[PDB]
Design a protein around this ligand. Structure first.
Ligand SMILES: CCCCCCCCCCCCCCCCCC(=O)OC[C@H](COP(=O)([O-])OCC(O)COP(=O)([O-])OC[C@@H](COC(=O)CCCCCCCCCCCCCCCCC)OC(=O)CCCCCCCCCCCCCCCCC)OC(=O)CCCCCCCCCCCCCCCCC
Ligand SMILES: CCCCCCCCCCCCCCCCCC(=O)OC[C@H](COP(=O)([O-])OCC(O)COP(=O)([O-])OC[C@@H](COC(=O)CCCCCCCCCCCCCCCCC)OC(=O)CCCCCCCCCCCCCCCCC)OC(=O)CCCCCCCCCCCCCCCCC
Ligand SMILES: CCCCCCCCCCCCCCCCCC(=O)OC[C@H](COP(=O)([O-])OCC(O)COP(=O)([O-])OC[C@@H](COC(=O)CCCCCCCCCCCCCCCCC)OC(=O)CCCCCCCCCCCCCCCCC)OC(=O)CCCCCCCCCCCCCCCCC
Ligand SMILES: CCCCCCCCCCCCCCCCCC(=O)OC[C@H](COP(=O)([O-])OCC[N+](C)(C)C)OC(=O)CCCCCCCCCCCCCCCCC
Ligand SMILES: CCCCCCCCCCCCCCCCCC(=O)OC[C@H](COP(=O)([O-])OCC[N+](C)(C)C)OC(=O)CCCCCCCCCCCCCCCCC
Ligand SMILES: CCCCCCCCCCCCCCCCCC(=O)OC[C@H](COP(=O)([O-])OCC[N+](C)(C)C)OC(=O)CCCCCCCCCCCCCCCCC
Ligand SMILES: CCCCCCCCCCCCCCCCCC(=O)OC[C@H](COP(=O)([O-])OCC[N+](C)(C)C)OC(=O)CCCCCCCCCCCCCCCCC
Ligand SMILES: CCCCCCCCCCCCCCCC(=O)OC[C@H](COP(=O)(O)O)OC(=O)CCCCCCCCCCCCCCC
Ligand code: SF4
Lengths: 64, 161, 67, 121, 142, 73, 93, 59, 283, 133, 58, 59, 102, 62
């Protein structure tokens, strides 16, 4: 098996177009009304090719 | 008159919509565990033809099962509005009914009925699986009878007008 | 391995009679194929062509009729 | 492949769909739809969707489609020999095995270069 | 049967079950063979792909070889404590051997009635080719 | 008075199978008689066919032989 | 003498009515197709491509003679329709 | 008629599919694609070659 | 009458077209009932596997559950999102329903028992499957839900895999039958079912069946846990009923295809008595 | 030319091939060519006419052959021109045509099962490994 | 199993070919008459066309 | 392999046979399909008919 | 690429009136490669008779059962050189695609 | 994955029996092909029983 590091990771360089987000990432609201989510999790997910990149969880939907 | 055809068709429609009564896969708190217990074999919900659907567009019942927080009330309102008509709402648990244990809290809404029109309430904390089954069956009977509750008056020929 | 086995078997099938020799080494194709393939092929030199039976004179049993 | 019966059956299927259209229209008599603010907005799990119509996806597996385009034709080229393999001769057998070996070698090269898997971009 | 008679497409179109006709045809051919048994020239000119002795030996030996193979298989792989599966597999091996032997015998019969087709008279040839024994009335005593 | 469970199950299986088997074997229900009549009509006749002059047996003789043998039943 | 069903068989039998209904509907569909394809031909005619070349020629000889040969040989200059709504060629070019 | 047995087999396979859905978990698209394009295409081609070799041997 | 007959030449044929339409309607209704019964069977089988009664009160002992659900889906109202394209949102499901109800033409119930004399049955199946995948992708795209669009992308990946998998399976199969017609398989399978030759690749055959049927482990497009509902997250009522009917139609007809091509079709399992059978009968 | 349908023509030819053998040979020799491409029928018209006249002569049959001819026609109708599947009935018709006198005893020596209506349904009874070719 | 099944399928195909031999024999028996009828019809049509062409072009 | 990500110094043909069995002939669709669908379906249903029966309670 | 469907704001009228309409007119006026092909309905269908001709000798001598015979005779007997060239071309194209991706 | 003596013996016997089974299967397939040849010969004899006439091509063909 040959190396695949370059195909597996993409770093970001200062003020570089190629080393940058060349796509509009999908900012999905995983939950709260999602079967996978337990019901009170609002996870802002940054998908890029259906691969998670950035997580922003909001968990205050069940604060009491 | 149209009633000759409407009334039997009304009965058929009521029977069909009672038999196929798909709730929404939406649980917020411990009452979701009781909802799953009512779904599972011991009290097979499928026996009464109720199958949970994930998307609100494919749901007939809104099972508000769990506490409602101020941070979530807009979400519940949006889900209720986006659920396709006709639809009914069943509050489950003390928290969903009237705020339950957290009625004196600064974050919990004092009842889901303040945000949604609640068709039926199921008291409990948590309501038993049989309690939820009873509430669902009573809601189904009421739904079947809602089509014609004797609103229109009968004339001398016994035809509603 | 299967290719080697089948090739060895085909080359060994020379023992059997002509009709049962390996089709890898011996050709058996429709009349449309054979006529065009061996029309003026002096290497085979099959001969004249039987129109109503679709075969050459030198092919085994070209014209086979009843009675 | 069929005949004009296929087109006539397409028309008949459209009429059958008209039947369901009639049923759906008739069903309108047994419910009323109220106008509400969020009743006709995109569903995003109980919250307003921030972006609409800018839903670009990342096509980081395009090599699979690229290779499918070639391999569909490669497989299609094998149909006549499979159909008429009873007529096979030395030349036809050699050509069929040659083509199959070429396909196998192309697949092996793709695996060696690791282009059959998801990549960063 | 897997293929049926080679001369005609058996049970194609209308299905025919005529045990009386089958018996009459068998009797006719048996009488023919008995009548021509003494003719040394005719016996000399009979040909078959596999010898009668060889096919008989195969028929009576294949089931035994299958049974021996099954016995070895159960001895090596099966637990002697239980017996249902061992008996089942031994019977399956014996049936496989019997299948090989019966196929040998049936192919011998097919060769006998095919290679020697030209030696039969016209009426018997027609009776064999077709499913009706009416072509060979004289042979079955009518 | 009691009956075996397997007897009852076989009764149910027969109830399911006999009607389904008959329906499958006779897809043209109640028109088998029409099919037989159509086959009879398709069957040709002496007048429809043209016969040899030096016939071994006449039409009447053939009819008598068929009646005696009960060729069709 | 409780001659009840075995537990596994009794459990299995719950879904049997669905199988019976499925068989009813499937037999209905198959019989409808069979009758629809049987009535026009009075038989289940074998597919044209499921036949030898000679068999195909023999089968279609009568249709060719009835549809093309007779009009072709009885043709007159004034038989053809002036609207050009004539029968299409057998091999359309 | 043949369609009786055909419907029986169709029902059997439908029940098999339903049971498989109720039993097995769900794959990932990338996982299945990798499995396919790395193993199963080769398996299919090898099986085809074996069939060709056997047919040539028997004919 | 002599000068009046010509006026009705084309008028007397319309009833024949009406009869053809009626027969097509009957066939489509019957296959719809078959699919509804298949749905009920699926629910009952899952109930058996999960040790539960299942539908038992919609009709006495749950005999009309599928009728009830179909009528309820008809009854349920539908609203198109304002931001979505009104024309396409309704056009795509219509085409999907038309394709699904055209599926049944490519089916055989006997040696030549088919509505049409089609020869390229496998080609028709492939084309119809590709069209249905197109419809699913368009549904996901025009429903701007991100989950729906991801479901459409997963459907595209599944279609890519299915192309090669089913193409290789068909290539292996035709090598024996030498034709695309379903009938030619049964004649060769009379003695032994074709699955015996493929016994080594039985696992791959099962994988192909599940993948084409879109059942687990290949329910990626409609994954209800990874995605909310899948491509139909924003579709309700008969619009979603059409997709469900199409999925079940595809399941039923590909099950028929597998049975015909690999399991003898309409031939009884005579291989169970192979040892005792005789290959010839000479009197 | 014959006013006769295709399958009936085949059935009649299966017997006529043995009565007009010399005419058939003449026609074949006339149409013989060095390539598979057919020869112009204008050259073989005369031989074709002779063969057709002999076929007209041979088509006549004795009335006793009518039952065999009808059953052969029914078989060739139920099967779309497959001569192999119906050769047995065609063979019986050929036998009846050749020396019809013996056909009387042929029918006399008939079993009860044979003395029954012959209905053909190939969908119900496909046969054994029927290739339809 | 694969090898044995391939062998069995080849056996079935060869049996089919064996029966195809007899089918071809029967077709050969029936061929000349239909060929003669078709040739006569073709020549009749050719004669009609020749007469029409001669009349039109003379 | 049980203790960590490392691999044995000398691989044996047993691993080859196991991998071939797992990949070429996928046992999941048969092993699990049988074990669950065909067997677990033989157990009596655990459902309690609520309208006509009640679940166990305590004083 | 171009998910939203928004396209370049392009006006085709300018080029249509400047270059394309007159060039197309000239090309249509001066372009006809069909030498003498005749439309259907050019002559009565009753004059055509060859389609009725049947060769029964060739029919019974023909054992083909599929419409792939010309395709096999071309790809594997006559044009086998081009078949192998196509195979090599596809292999080299796969290699080129991999290199382009890298 | 260390193996005990009994397991190693079982594996070795399995391998030996697999080899023998494969060899036997190949031999039986060879025998089956020979049987097919014999059946073809028999059917050829049967068919050629009555088809013994060969008609020479006419001299005008050339
Ligand atoms: C032509 C092609 C043909 C096909 C080709 C296929 C080729 C494939 C090749 C590749 C694969 C190879 C596989 C080889 C495997 C063997 C390897 C081996 O030797 O390993 C040794 C390995 C080592 O084991 P061991 O250490 O020796 O231990 C022994 C075991 O303990 C075992 O202990 P035991 O022996 O004490 O107990 C087990 C014994 C238990 O036996 C019993 O209990 C007896 C049977 C009881 C029957 C119960 C049901 C009765 C139903 C009655 C219904 C009546 C209803 C009436 C009312 C009707 C009204 C309509 O089980 C059997 O052996 C049963 C066998 C008998 C089956 C029934 C007869 C079938 C005949 C088939 C036709 C034959 C005709 C001849 C021609 C054939 C041509 C092909 O042995 C095993 O693992 C044995 C496993 C045995 C499993 C048995 C399973 C039976 C079937 C279960 C069905 C359940 C269905 C439930 C309902 C489903 C509803 C949906
Ligand atoms: C103007 C014209 C007038 C004409 C004359 C008058 C009219 C005559 C009409 C005659 C026919 C009418 C229908 C009779 C139905 C009788 C039902 C019965 O016995 O009641 C008890 C039966 C009790 O069932 P249940 O209460 O639901 O079940 C209780 C528990 O499930 C526990 O259940 P269980 O333990 O008792 O077992 C259930 C199952 C037990 O049965 C079995 O176990 C065997 C059956 C299942 C076979 C499975 C094969 C596949 C196996 C797959 C693998 C193994 C399975 C396990 C898999 C999973 C393992 C993990 O037993 C049955 O239900 C058997 C009854 C079979 C009825 C079907 C008969 C016809 C079917 C074929 C079509 C016929 C077309 C017309 C023919 C006309 C000429 C004859 O009553 C029902 O509820 C019916 C269930 C079946 C559905 C029937 C649907 C009929 C719809 C109407 C069709 C109309 C068109 C045809 C008529 C047209 C006019 C000719
Ligand atoms: C109330 C006040 C009064 C109102 C009055 C209204 C107006 C009345 C009529 C007035 C005008 C009368 C004019 C009469 C003179 C002119 C007649 C004319 O021109 O025709 C001659 C014209 C040519 O004359 P011909 O050559 O002498 O004819 C001889 C035969 O054609 C020779 O046959 P073949 O030997 O060639 O054999 C093939 C023949 C034989 O084929 C047959 O027709 C025999 C039967 C086949 C199987 C039937 C099975 C049905 C059940 C399946 C399972 C369903 C389950 C699901 C549904 C639930 C069911 C409970 O098949 C065909 O010809 C193909 C036709 C296919 C028919 C399509 C299927 C029919 C059933 C439709 C089902 C619809 C979906 C379910 C609806 C559910 C509703 C709850 O003949 C025809 O074309 C006959 C067509 C007959 C069609 C079928 C008729 C129904 C048969 C009885 C079954 C009834 C089932 C009802 C179910 C109800 C459930 C609630
Ligand atoms: C009121 C306004 C009306 C406006 C005009 C209507 C426009 C209709 C456009 C679609 C239908 C076109 C019909 C004419 C072309 C017929 C071609 C032909 O010969 O076919 C039969 C031919 C039959 O040929 P044949 O082989 O039987 O030969 C006939 C022999 N003679 C000449 C002697 C009669 O088909 C075939 O040969 C193979 C079967 C093809 C089956 C195709 C199925 C798919 C069709 C999809 C159509 C989708 C249309 C709608 C969507 C797309 C937008 C248009
Ligand atoms: C071969 C077998 C064929 C079998 C066919 C079986 C299919 C049967 C389909 C039945 C459809 C019934 C439609 C009812 C529509 C009226 C009700 C409705 O929609 O309500 C909402 C609206 C009315 O809503 P509303 O404002 O009164 O609200 C009702 C609610 N309440 C009672 C609370 C006030 O419908 C209307 O606009 C009604 C008036 C206009 C329509 C009048 C009837 C027209 C009928 C047309 C028939 C066309 C037949 C075509 C046949 C050929 C087809 C190819
Ligand atoms: C739908 C899926 C069905 C799967 C069923 C699985 C059930 C479980 C397994 C049951 C196995 C029962 C044992 C016999 C199986 C059939 C064997 C076979 O193909 O023989 C037919 C063959 C029949 O072939 P034949 O067609 O040549 O028979 C003779 C033919 N004539 C009449 C023309 C002479 O049997 C034999 O001839 C004996 C063996 C010959 C050597 C070659 C055999 C190759 C294949 C062997 C496979 C063995 C697998 C089992 C191993 C042992 C397990 C304990
Ligand atoms: C299109 C649908 C699919 C068609 C597939 C083609 C038919 C194939 C039939 C089966 C043949 C055998 C295949 C290999 C099975 C290997 C099982 C195995 O791993 O055993 C060990 C397995 C487990 O052993 P294991 O070692 O593999 O894994 C367990 C691991 N340890 C040891 C750690 C616990 O034991 C079993 O339980 C095996 C039971 C097998 C039973 C299979 C039943 C299948 C029934 C449905 C088949 C389809 C029927 C269609 C009928 C159609 C009629 C018209
Ligand atoms: C297509 C699906 C069905 C399968 C059809 C193909 C079957 C192929 C295998 C047939 C049996 C081979 C027996 C060999 C006995 C032997 O030598 O046995 C020698 C040793 C014995 O090992 P043990 O001492 O552990 O018993 O085994 C090996 O060396 C293993 C060889 C590899 C076998 C893997 C399975 C086959 C994979 C496909 C072939 C390519 C193998 C490449 C290996 C590097
Ligand atoms: S009502 Fe009781 S059981 Fe329900 S969510 Fe509130 S605390 Fe939990």
């Amino acid at each position: 098996m040959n190396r695949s590091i370059f195909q597996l990771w993409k770093p970001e360089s200062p003020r570089s177009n190629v080393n940058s987000k060349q796509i509009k990432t999908m900012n999905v609201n995983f939950g709260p009304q999602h079967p996978a989510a337990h019901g009170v999790l609002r996870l802002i997910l940054q998908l890029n090719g259906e691969i998670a990149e950035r997580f922003d969880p909001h968990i205050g939907l069940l604060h009491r | 008159r149209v009633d000759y055809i409407v009334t039997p068709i009304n009965a058929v429609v009521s029977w069909a919509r009672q038999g196929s009564f798909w709730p929404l896969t939406f649980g917020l708190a411990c009452c979701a565990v009781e909802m799953m217990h009512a779904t599972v074999s011991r009290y097979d919900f499928d026996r009464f033809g109720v199958i949970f659907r994930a998307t609100p567009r494919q749901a007939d019942l809104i099972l508000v099962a769990g506490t409602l927080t101020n941070k979530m009330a807009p979400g519940l309102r949006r889900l209720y509005e986006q659920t396709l008509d006709p639809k009914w709402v069943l509050s489950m648990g003390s928290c969903a009914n009237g705020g339950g244990y957290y009625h004196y809290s600064y974050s919990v809404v004092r009842g889901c009925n303040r945000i949604i029109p609640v068709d039926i309430y199921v008291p409990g904390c948590p309501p038993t699986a049989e309690a939820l089954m009873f509430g669902v069956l009573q809601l189904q009977k009421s739904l079947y009878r809602q089509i014609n509750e004797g609103e229109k008056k009968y004339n001398k020929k016994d035809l509603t007008y | 391995f299967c290719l080697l086995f089948v090739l060895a078997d085909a080359w060994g099938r020379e023992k059997y009679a002509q009709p049962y020799k390996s089709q890898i080494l011996h050709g058996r194709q429709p009349f449309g194929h054979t006529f065009v393939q061996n029309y003026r092929n002096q290497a085979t030199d099959l001969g004249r062509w039987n129109h109503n039976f679709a075969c050459y004179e030198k092919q085994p049993g070209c014209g086979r009729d009843f009675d | 492949m069929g005949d004009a019966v296929v087109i006539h059956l397409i028309q008949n299927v459209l009429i059958f769909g008209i039947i369901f259209w009639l049923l759906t229209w008739g069903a309108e008599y047994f419910y009323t739809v109220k106008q509400q603010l969020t009743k006709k907005q995109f569903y995003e799990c109980g919250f307003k969707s921030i972006s609409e119509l800018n839903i670009q996806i990342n096509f980081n597996f395009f090599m699979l489609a690229v290779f499918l385009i070639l391999y569909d034709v490669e497989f299609t080229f094998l149909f006549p020999v499979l159909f008429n393999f009873s007529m096979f001769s030395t030349t036809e057998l050699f050509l069929a095995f040659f083509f199959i070996f070429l396909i196998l070698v192309s697949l092996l090269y793709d695996w060696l270069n690791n282009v059959l898997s998801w990549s960063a971009e | 049967t897997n293929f049926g008679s080679p001369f005609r497409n058996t049970d194609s179109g209308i299905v025919i079950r005529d045990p009386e006709n089958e018996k009459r045809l068998k009797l006719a051919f048996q009488n023919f063979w008995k009548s021509k048994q003494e003719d040394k020239e005719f016996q000399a000119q009979i040909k078959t792909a596999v010898s009668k002795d060889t096919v008989n030996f195969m028929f009576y030996a294949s089931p035994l070889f299958g049974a021996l193979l099954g016995k070895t298989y159960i001895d090596m792989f099966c637990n002697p404590r239980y017996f249902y599966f061992r008996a089942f597999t031994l019977s399956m091996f014996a049936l496989a051997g019997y299948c090989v032997g019966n196929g040998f015998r049936n192919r011998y019969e097919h060769s006998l009635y095919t290679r020697n087709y030209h030696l039969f008279p016209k009426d018997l040839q027609d009776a064999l080719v077709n499913g009706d024994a009416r072509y060979c009335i004289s042979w079955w005593k009518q | 008075m009691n009956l075996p469970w397997f007897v009852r199950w076989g009764t149910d299986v027969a109830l399911f199978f006999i009607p389904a088997y008959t329906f499958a074997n006779y897809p043209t229900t109640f028109f088998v008689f029409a099919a037989e009549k159509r086959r009879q009509r398709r069957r040709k006749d002496f007048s429809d066919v043209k016969l040899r002059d030096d016939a071994a047996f006449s039409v009447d003789q053939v009819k008598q032989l068929q009646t005696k043998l009960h060729l069709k039943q | 003498v409780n001659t009840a069903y075995p537990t596994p068989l009794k459990t299995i039998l719950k879904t049997t009515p669905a199988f019976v209904v499925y068989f009813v509907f499937g037999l209905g569909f198959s019989t409808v197709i069979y009758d629809v394809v049987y009535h026009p031909k009075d038989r289940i005619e074998r597919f044209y491509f499921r036949s030898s070349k000679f068999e195909r020629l023999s089968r279609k000889r009568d249709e060719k003679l009835r549809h093309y040969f007779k009009p072709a040989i009885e043709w007159q200059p004034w038989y053809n329709t002036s609207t050009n709504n004539n029968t299409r060629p057998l091999l359309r070019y | 008629m043949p369609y009786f047995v055909l419907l029986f087999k169709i029902l059997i396979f439908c029940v098999v599919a339903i049971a498989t859905r109720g039993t097995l978990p769900r794959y990932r698209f990338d996982q299945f694609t990798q499995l396919n394009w790395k193993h199963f295409i080769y398996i299919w081609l090898g099986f085809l070659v074996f069939n060709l070799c056997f047919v040539t041997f028997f004919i | 009458g002599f000068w009046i007959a010509p006026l009705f030449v084309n008028i007397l044929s319309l009833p024949l077209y009406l009869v053809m339409l009626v027969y097509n309607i009957v066939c489509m209704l019957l296959i719809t009932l078959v699919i509804a019964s298949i749905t009920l069977i699926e629910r009952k089988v899952l109930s058996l596997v999960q040790r539960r009664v299942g539908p038992h009160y919609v009709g006495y002992r749950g005999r009309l559950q599928y009728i009830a659900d179909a009528l309820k889906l008809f009854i349920k109202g539908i609203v198109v999102p304002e931001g979505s394209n009104k024309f396409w949102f309704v056009a795509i499901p219509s085409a999907a329903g038309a394709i699904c109800y055209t599926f049944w033409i490519n089916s055989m119930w006997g040696p030549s028992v088919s509505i049409f004399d089609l020869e390229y049955n496998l080609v028709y199946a492939t084309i119809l499957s590709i069209l249905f995948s197109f419809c699913i992708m368009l549904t996901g795209y025009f429903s701007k839900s991100k989950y729906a669009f991801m479901a459409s992308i997963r459907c595209a990946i599944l279609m890519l895999n299915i192309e090669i998998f089913l193409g290789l399976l068909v290539i292996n199969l035709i090598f024996i039958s030498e034709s695309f017609c379903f009938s030619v398989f049964v004649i060769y399978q009379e003695i032994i079912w074709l699955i015996f030759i493929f016994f080594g690749v039985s696992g791959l055959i099962f994988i192909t069946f599940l993948l084409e049927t879109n059942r687990a482990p290949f329910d990626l497009a409609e994954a209800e846990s990874e995605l909310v509902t899948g491509y139909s997250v924003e579709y309700g009522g008969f619009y979603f009923a059409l997709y469900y009917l199409g999925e079940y139609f595809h399941l039923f007809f590909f099950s028929m295809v597998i049975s015909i091509v690999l399991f003898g079709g309409w031939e009884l399992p005579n291989f169970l008595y192979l040892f005792l059978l005789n290959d010839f009968n000479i009197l | 030319k014959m006013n006769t349908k295709s399958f009936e023509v085949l059935i009649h030819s299966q017997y006529a091939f043995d009565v007009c053998r010399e005419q058939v040979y003449n026609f074949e020799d006339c149409r013989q060519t060095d390539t598979p491409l057919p020869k112009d029928p204008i050259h073989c018209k005369a031989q074709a006419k002779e063969v057709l006249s002999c076929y007209k002569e041979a088509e006549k049959m004795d009335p006793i052959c009518l039952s065999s001819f009808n059953d052969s026609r029914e078989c060739m109708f139920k099967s779309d021109g497959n001569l192999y599947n119906c050769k047995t009935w065609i063979n019986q018709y050929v036998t009846c045509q050749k020396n019809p006198a013996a056909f009387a005893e042929f029918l006399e020596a008939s079993t009860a099962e044979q003395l029954k209506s012959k209905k053909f349904d190939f969908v119900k009874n496909r046969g054994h490994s029927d290739k339809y070719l | 199993l694969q090898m044995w099944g391939v062998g069995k399928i080849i056996e079935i195909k060869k049996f089919m070919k064996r029966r195809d031999i007899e089918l071809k024999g029967l077709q050969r028996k029936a061929a000349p008459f239909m060929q003669s009828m078709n040739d006569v019809r073709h020549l009749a049509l050719r004669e009609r066309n020749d007469m029409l062409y001669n009349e039109l072009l003379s | 392999r049980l203790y960590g990500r490392d691999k044995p110094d000398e691989l044996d043909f047993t691993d080859v046979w196991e991998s071939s069995y797992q990949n070429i002939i996928c046992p999941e669709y048969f092993y699990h399909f049988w074990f669950c669908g065909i067997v677990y379906s033989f157990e009596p249903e655990w459902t309690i008919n609520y309208p006509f029966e009640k679940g166990p309670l305590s004083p | 690429l171009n998910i939203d469907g928004l396209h370049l704001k392009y006006n085709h009228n300018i080029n249509n009136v400047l270059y394309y309409t007159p060039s197309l007119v000239l090309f249509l006026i001066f372009f006809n490669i069909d030498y003498f092909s005749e439309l259907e309905l050019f002559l009565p269908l009753e004059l055509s008779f060859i389609d009725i001709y049947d060769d029964y000798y060739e029919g019974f001598n023909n054992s083909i059962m599929n419409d792939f015979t010309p395709l096999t005779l071309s790809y594997y007997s006559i044009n086998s050189a081009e078949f192998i060239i196509i195979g090599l071309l596809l292999l080299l194209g796969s290699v080129a695609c991999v290199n382009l991706y890298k | 994955l260390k193996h005990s003596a009994t397991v190693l013996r079982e594996i070795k016997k399995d391998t030996i029996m697999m080899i023998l089974f494969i060899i036997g299967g190949f031999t039986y397939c060879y025998h089956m092909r020979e049987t097919r040849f014999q059946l073809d010969d028999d059917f050829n004899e049967y068919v050629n029983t009555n088809k013994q006439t060969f008609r020479p091509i006419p001299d005008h063909v050339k």
